[PDB]
Design a protein around this ligand. Structure first.
Ligand SMILES: *[C@@H]1O[C@H](CO)[C@@H](O[C@@H]2O[C@H](CO)[C@@H](O)[C@H](O)[C@H]2NC(C)=O)[C@H](O)[C@H]1NC(C)=O
Ligand SMILES: *[C@@H]1O[C@H](CO)[C@@H](O[C@@H]2O[C@H](CO)[C@@H](O)[C@H](O)[C@H]2NC(C)=O)[C@H](O)[C@H]1NC(C)=O
Ligand SMILES: CC(=O)N[C@@H]1[C@@H](O)[C@H](O)[C@@H](CO)O[C@H]1O
Ligand SMILES: CC(=O)N[C@@H]1[C@@H](O)[C@H](O)[C@@H](CO)O[C@H]1O
Ligand SMILES: CC(=O)N[C@@H]1[C@@H](O)[C@H](O)[C@@H](CO)O[C@H]1O
Ligand SMILES: CC(=O)N[C@@H]1[C@@H](O)[C@H](O)[C@@H](CO)O[C@H]1O
Ligand SMILES: *[C@@H]1O[C@H](CO)[C@@H](O)[C@H](O)[C@H]1NC(C)=O
Ligand SMILES: *[C@@H]1O[C@H](CO)[C@@H](O)[C@H](O)[C@H]1NC(C)=O
Ligand SMILES: *[C@@H]1O[C@H](CO)[C@@H](O)[C@H](O)[C@H]1NC(C)=O
Lengths: 127, 265, 49, 379, 49, 49
């Protein structure tokens, strides 16, 4: 935020700050560029495919056992086992306690759709 | 009215190492399960604390006061009572008298004209009475007076199997006097030395006095013929340093570490 | 404003404003640098995929 | 708004950001502990008898609360002045000492107590400093002190060889010497006693009857303050944005119930960010939690400028049961209340979006909203 | 200069020149970042060619 | 160390300081732009007048 961080809920300071110019304007412009580029990064990395494939129910791949990487419907999410270990092994109120006008926008893509891309990639590369 | 006996051999003051004692809450705030660093006056870890042992044995000389003091007493019969703080101790300027003998914890700021030896200990012939309480000899202009309930103690003097540890720290700043207190029973082993453990000090009261002080001398409660029970008390000094403290989830200080002791620290 | 006068406290408020603005500029600068590094890593990851 | 921000008369189809959103405080509250340990002026004002002027009773008052409100509103008063400061604001003036000079004197010589004026009482009994900052109260007292039988037990010095400095009491009344002729022993020639005994009965002249006068003196900020008037506190409000002040705890937010445990001496609360978030009410003994006022950014979703003119408004990170407060006149930061109330409000992770209906078929993304939500303009 | 003495106005003009210099510094830092990104893109294009 | 001594009007010391100008500061004496030193002035009407 432009003014909330510097001298928020102040009147005369707000009046005396606006005479510096367009500083927080270019601040917000730079941050918006950062955010849109952040979304573009995942868009570039994961969206190499177009059709969302799906593996057949039969899982006899010539003796190879892919049960570790393929999704398992037991969990509510369509996540594999290694994915579960990865999500458990990483830990950060911290997403909220920052309250001086410092918002944290959510990513455009959620984890479920990213997992669905990953599943499509796996199915395509194995079938 | 004061009578002197003296005739005591002056043993050198003993020396001990303050293990970890001398940590107190710096302000009235609440922090949960967080580590916080600060700078303030403190008693440094592992410093030379001066030990007095008093039993026929009579030791209570004048001591220098600077940056506050950390006083401790390991004892059971509670024979030491009061405190006299001042800058001259000759009724030229007001002084602090703190007395908690039997009736009420009483704090008086006044230009009392004192004696040489402030005594209330000797009392014929097998007990203790607060006779000869004329440790002061005049009451000129007593600006401030404060009265409250007495602390936790026992009745009458005795000796053997010390079981009480009473610690206090006195600090005067910006005219305000701060007294922090802590009490702990059931001391098992007594090598006439401070125990090994952790215990944070606690706030007790604030006094808005605002006078000049430079030295202090303790008080313990006719004046010929006696052999009192054993006792042991300790004095330590302070200086500015910086510490780190670890509050727990319940909001009480649990551990503290120094910053200018070792490379590890 | 409670203590100081209403015409010269502006010096102190200007000091604080300049300090905070400089801090914000520093923060966004390191944000740009880290974003560039992450972009390089993301391009490498895309090539790997 | 977006036309003004983009500095152009046309805006291209997409999402844009505008000024932010904030909520103003509804009211104000203050809180201070119980008013106790009143200053014992009641006994002095209700005392049976005050001494003479050369025996001026000087009393010390400190470390208490002086209820100047009940001072101003006592029935039997006849005079109540403060020549150093305004008598009205004594409720908010904290001095480190109080000296009370109490007496009963003839009503015709009261004005001599004001400094800079002569008088027997003000020259040989008791004067006051020229820089005196204090107050004087004079009321009728002949109704209880004066009797028809004869009340001569009041005294006042009439003669002396010097004027005493301020704050000086004298008891000696040696046989006054005036000329060069020596005097001693008992009454004789040119041996006049310094004092004279009063006579206070309700049958003397009107205005000569005795009046009870008390003078209040005080110091000004060279030692810790001791006495001053009560600080009034309003009641308490919950679950609404207010402007609290709990013993100098200026701030703004919403006050809610707390479910943590403090310590008997602990009073405040703070976090890793080192800001106040939890308090203990002074008068009562429970814990209250402080939550900052709700606020967030504002974004507009628009199609191309020429294609249409309808828009949609997105409030970032706001629980949408609170935007009814934003659905108000002169309460929300934006002024365009026309879209404050609009179409079917839809709730997402980033807030609730006003001006669109959430259909549930599938299409590509045109305007990225976030958290798996994309918006477009269609049929 | 046209309305005040030199001894005081020189402080104000020093404030102004410092602010302008800092703004120029910010512009140049942004230019450096953009140039680095463009250099990376140019190297990629050279490899493509 | 150089010392300058004179007698002026009590209502003219305001123009003695550098920066500002005046008749006494244009026709009789004036300080440089960045003078370093001290000035001591007092009344002398008990003797001079
Ligand atoms: C592929 O490997 C998985 C384990 O990684 C096998 O699942 C195990 O199956 C046995 C008996 O069916 C169970 O006792 C184990 O508890 C299972 N492991 C886990 C982790 O659940 C699976 O049977 C293998 N499939 C093939 C075709 O080899
Ligand atoms: C402050 O004073 C008030 C009023 O004297 C006290 O109010 C008490 O409130 C409880 C809860 O409703 C009642 O049960 C008591 O009867 C009240 N006491 C009265 C009316 O005298 C309040 O307890 C006081 N608080 C402190 C900390 O002293
Ligand atoms: C209370 C008092 O007057 N004590 C004195 C003591 O100080 C002095 O040393 C002694 C001389 O023998 O006489 C006695
Ligand atoms: C005053 C004095 O001698 N104090 C000693 C110190 O010198 C010594 O180092 C320490 C042993 O650890 O015991 C104590
Ligand atoms: C203060 C005083 O008078 N103390 C005396 C003490 O000196 C004397 O030894 C004792 C027995 O005679 O009686 C008592
Ligand atoms: C501070 C003080 O005492 N001020 C008094 C003033 O009230 C009074 O009107 C005046 C007349 O004597 O003398 C002075
Ligand atoms: C007006 O906007 C439309 C799209 O909404 C576009 O096709 C057309 O070219 C625009 N007209 C102009 C820019 O003159
Ligand atoms: C907003 O808050 C209310 C009450 O706290 C809750 O019932 C509602 O579900 C919240 N809205 C959300 C989480 O979108
Ligand atoms: C789509 O929305 C309609 C209307 O709310 C509802 O009846 C239907 O069940 C929804 N379909 C799905 C798949 O959620």
């Amino acid at each position: 935020d432009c003014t909330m961080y510097i001298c928020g809920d102040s009147t005369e300071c707000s009046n005396l700050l606006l005479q510096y110019g367009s500083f927080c304007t270019q601040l917000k412009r730079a941050l918006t560029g950062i955010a849109v580029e952040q979304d573009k990064n995942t868009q570039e990395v994961f969206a190499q495919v177009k059709q969302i494939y799906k593996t057949p129910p039969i899982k006899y791949f010539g003796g190879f056992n892919f049960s570790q990487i393929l999704p398992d419907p037991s969990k509510p999410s369509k996540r594999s086992f290694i994915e579960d270990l990865l999500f458990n092994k990483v830990t950060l109120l911290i997403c909220a306690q920052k309250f001086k006008g410092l918002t944290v926008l959510p990513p455009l893509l959620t984890d479920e759709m990213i997992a669905q891309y990953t599943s499509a990639l796996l199915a395509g590369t194995i079938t | 009215q004061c009578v002197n006996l003296t005739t005591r051999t002056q043993l050198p003051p003993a020396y001990t190492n303050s293990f970890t004692r001398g940590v107190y809450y710096p302000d009235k705030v609440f922090r949960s399960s967080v580590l916080h660093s600060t700078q303030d006056l403190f008693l440094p870890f592992f410093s030379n604390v001066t030990w007095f042992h008093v039993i026929k044995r009579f030791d209570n000389p004048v001591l220098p006061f600077n940056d506050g003091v950390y006083f401790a007493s390991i004892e059971k019969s509670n024979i030491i009572r009061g405190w006299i703080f001042g800058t001259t101790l000759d009724s030229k300027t007001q002084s602090l008298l703190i007395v908690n003998n039997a009736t009420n914890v009483v704090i008086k700021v006044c230009e009392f004209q004192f004696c040489n030896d402030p005594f209330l200990d000797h009392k014929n012939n097998k007990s203790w009475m607060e006779s000869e309480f004329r440790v002061y000899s005049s009451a000129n202009n007593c600006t401030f007076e404060y009265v409250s309930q007495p602390f936790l103690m026992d009745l009458e003097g005795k000796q053997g199997n010390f079981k009480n540890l009473r610690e206090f720290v006195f600090k005067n700043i910006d005219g305000y006097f701060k007294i922090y207190s802590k009490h702990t029973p059931i001391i098992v082993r007594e090598p006439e030395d401070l125990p090994q453990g952790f215990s944070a000090l606690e706030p007790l009261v604030d006094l808005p006095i605002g006078i000049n002080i430079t030295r202090f001398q303790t008080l313990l409660a006719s004046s010929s013929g006696w052999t009192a029970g054993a006792a042991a008390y300790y004095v330590g000094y302070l200086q500015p340093r910086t510490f780190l403290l670890k509050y727990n989830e319940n909001g009480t200080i649990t551990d503290a570490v120094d910053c200018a002791l070792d490379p590890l620290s | 404003f409670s203590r100081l006068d209403k015409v010269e406290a502006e010096v102190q408020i200007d000091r604080l404003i300049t300090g905070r603005l400089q801090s914000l500029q520093t923060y966004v600068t390191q944000q740009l640098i880290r974003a560039a590094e992450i972009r390089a890593s993301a391009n490498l990851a895309a090539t790997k995929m | 708004e977006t036309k003004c921000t983009l500095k152009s008369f046309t805006v291209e189809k997409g999402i844009y950001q505008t000024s932010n959103f904030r909520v103003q405080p509804t009211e104000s509250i203050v809180r201070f502990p119980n008013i106790t340990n009143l200053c014992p002026f009641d006994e002095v004002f209700n005392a049976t008898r005050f001494a003479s002027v050369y025996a001026w009773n000087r009393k010390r008052i400190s470390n208490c609360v002086a209820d100047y409100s009940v001072l101003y509103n006592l029935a039997p008063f006849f005079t109540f002045k403060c020549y150093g400061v305004s008598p009205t604001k004594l409720n908010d003036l904290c001095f480190t000492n109080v000296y009370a000079d109490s007496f009963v004197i003839r009503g015709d010589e009261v004005r001599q107590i004001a400094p800079g004026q002569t008088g027997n009482i003000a020259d040989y009994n008791y004067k006051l400093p020229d820089d005196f900052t204090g107050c004087v109260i004079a009321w009728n007292s002949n109704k209880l002190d004066s009797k028809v039988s004869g009340n001569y037990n009041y005294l006042y010095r009439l003669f002396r060889k010097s004027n005493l400095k301020p704050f000086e009491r004298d008891i000696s009344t040696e046989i006054y010497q005036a000329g060069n002729k020596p005097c001693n022993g008992v009454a004789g020639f040119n041996c006049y006693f310094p004092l004279r005994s009063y006579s206070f009965r309700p049958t003397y002249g009107v205005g000569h009857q005795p009046y009870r006068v008390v003078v209040l003196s005080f110091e000004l900020l060279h030692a810790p303050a001791t006495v001053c008037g009560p600080k009034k506190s309003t009641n308490l409000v919950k679950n609404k944005c207010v402007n609290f002040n709990f013993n100098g705890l200026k701030g703004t937010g919403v006050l809610t119930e707390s479910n943590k445990k403090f310590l008997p001496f602990q009073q405040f609360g703070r976090d890793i960010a080192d800001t106040t978030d939890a308090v203990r009410d002074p008068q009562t003994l429970e814990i209250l939690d402080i939550t900052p006022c709700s606020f967030g950014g504002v974004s507009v979703i628009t199609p191309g400028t020429n294609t249409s003119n309808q828009v949609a408004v997105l409030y970032q990170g706001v629980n949408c049961t609170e935007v009814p407060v934003a659905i108000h006149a002169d309460q929300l930061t934006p002024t365009w209340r026309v879209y404050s109330t609009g179409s079917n409000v839809f709730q997402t992770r980033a807030g609730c979006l006003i001006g669109a209906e959430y259909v549930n078929n599938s299409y590509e993304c045109d305007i990225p909203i976030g958290a798996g939500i994309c918006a477009s303009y269609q049929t």
